Amino acid sequence: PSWLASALACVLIFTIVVDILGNLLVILSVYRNKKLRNAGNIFVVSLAVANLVVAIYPYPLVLMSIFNNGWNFGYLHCQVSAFLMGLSVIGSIWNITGIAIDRYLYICHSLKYDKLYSSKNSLCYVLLIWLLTLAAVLPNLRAGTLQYDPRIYSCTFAQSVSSAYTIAVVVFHFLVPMIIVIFCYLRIWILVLQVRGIDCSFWNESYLTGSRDERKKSLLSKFGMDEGVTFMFIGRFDRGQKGVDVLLKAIEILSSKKEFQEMRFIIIGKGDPELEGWARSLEEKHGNVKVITEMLSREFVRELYGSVDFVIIPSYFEPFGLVALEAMCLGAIPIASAVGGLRDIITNETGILVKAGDPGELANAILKALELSRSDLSKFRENCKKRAMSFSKLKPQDFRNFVTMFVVFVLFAICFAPLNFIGLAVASDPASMVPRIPEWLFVASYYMAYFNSCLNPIIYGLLDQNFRKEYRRIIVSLCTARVFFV
Numbered sequence: 001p002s003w004l005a006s007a008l009a010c011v012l013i014f015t016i017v018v019d020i021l022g023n024l025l026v027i028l029s030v031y032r033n034k035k036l037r038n039a040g041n042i043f044v045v046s047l048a049v050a051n052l053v054v055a056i057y058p059y060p061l062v063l064m065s066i067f068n069n070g071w072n073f074g075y076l077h078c079q080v081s082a083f084l085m086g087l088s089v090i091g092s093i094w095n096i097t098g099i100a101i102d103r104y105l106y107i108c109h110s111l112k113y114d115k116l117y118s119s120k121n122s123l124c125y126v127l128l129i130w131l132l133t134l135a136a137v138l139p140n141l142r143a144g145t146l147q148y149d150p151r152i153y154s155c156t157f158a159q160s161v162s163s164a165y166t167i168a169v170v171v172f173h174f175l176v177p178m179i180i181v182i183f184c185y186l187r188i189w190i191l192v193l194q195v196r197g198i199d200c201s202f203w204n205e206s207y208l209t210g211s212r213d214e215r216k217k218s219l220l221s222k223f224g225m226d227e228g229v230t231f232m233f234i235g236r237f238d239r240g241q242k243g244v245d246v247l248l249k250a251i252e253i254l255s256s257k258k259e260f261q262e263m264r265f266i267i268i269g270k271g272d273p274e275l276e277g278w279a280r281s282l283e284e285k286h287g288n289v290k291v292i293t294e295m296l297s298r299e300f301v302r303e304l305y306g307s308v309d310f311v312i313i314p315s316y317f318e319p320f321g322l323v324a325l326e327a328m329c330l331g332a333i334p335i336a337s338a339v340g341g342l343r344d345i346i347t348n349e350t351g352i353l354v355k356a357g358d359p360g361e362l363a364n365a366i367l368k369a370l371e372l373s374r375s376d377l378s379k380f381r382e383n384c385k386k387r388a389m390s391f392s393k394l395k396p397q398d399f400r401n402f403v404t405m406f407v408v409f410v411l412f413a414i415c416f417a418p419l420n421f422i423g424l425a426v427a428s429d430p431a432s433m434v435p436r437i438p439e440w441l442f443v444a445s446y447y448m449a450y451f452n453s454c455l456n457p458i459i460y461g462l463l464d465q466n467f468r469k470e471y472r473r474i475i476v477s478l479c480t481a482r483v484f485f486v
């Protein structure tokens, strides 16, 4: 591996200079730019320090130790250069975990309130992380798991010294954050999609005509059944997806009760012809249950939302669930099973929540829904309308900062995924798998993780226009131009 030594010098040389100047601009830009000066980006400076620390002291020692092919400094230099690298890399996730949490709170808050989320505790909240990162890394001095490795020319955490410490490192300081940050950004993506796909000019009460009671008496008279509390299912028919099967079991459970007489059901959809035969059966047996097996226009569906009292959404899985939100626009109060999407949308004040896949709990919800007077429903419909209106409030917003912080996270995971994956293979049998693991894969896994300390400024430049507009200002002020009297 002759040239493979010289190459490893380049990678660090790049990494140290880019990290030094790059993350120096990131601190400057946040202090210098009023748009980037918000307290939510306190985490970005804390992260840019963590990146920037390992280029002042550790990577210099490791760069020299490549050209030496050996450690030529003290054991303290080895024990301390290793220690700062751990304060960095562990702090760099737990910062990134904070950012992912911060921006989840930012979206959820801005739905519920009309005065931007302030990130009020962020400086105080950073000091919890740097205690958490100092508490996790500090035990490795006394246990003696920090030692020089000749393959990577560096002093670092030896995985093979104790598999108790590696598995604890890998689970608690990679897999636990990885799960938190995926969960955060996934639930953000659902909400930003729910925002994207809600046509407010279509799903609007304006397009309807009279009062509600009159429009309902019309709709029910149009199907040939009397006045009553009306319920509506509208989703394709299937044994386990959108949940028409749970509804039909629930209607049979209700049919015997005295309170059934005061109910009206309007089932819409097409799919399993046996479930269509089961629904058509309940149509023939009871005149208060109507079943519509063909394709209705969204024009007409709008009116049904506008006319009925409740919309039943008994879905097993339902990732986005606009059907709930669209219906709330026109005062339809959803009774809907707790699912990702519906748990985000439906609050406990707007509509009713049910344990998914249960005829009895759905029936007792329909019974709970029934025991509700005309005056009591008015506020529910108001809350439903206010709730759907908050999703359209976010439609024109700039969502690019979510991408910039997510791309930070994605590139982090890529760099440290190998090192943590290897660290589990080492943990299985330290004696066996230190030689058995491919020797290039060990070297690559480490030098990506180092290279990650120069990547944050490069990403902020390309994706966030405020940072790029400030790199122009920061660079063109210091270096470019000066005073000059004519």
Ligand SMILES: COc1ccc2[nH]c(-c3ccccc3)c(CCNC(C)=O)c2c1
Pocket (backbone or CB within 6 Å): 082, 083, 085, 086, 087, 089, 136, 137, 140, 156, 157, 159, 166, 169, 170, 419, 420, 423, 446, 449, 450
């Ligand atoms: C928790 O104690 C420490 C203590 C010091 C540490 N230094 C590094 C490291 C820094 C840059 C590139 C590669 C590894 C780790 C991270 C080591 N993680 C694994 C799975 O081996 C580290 C951990």
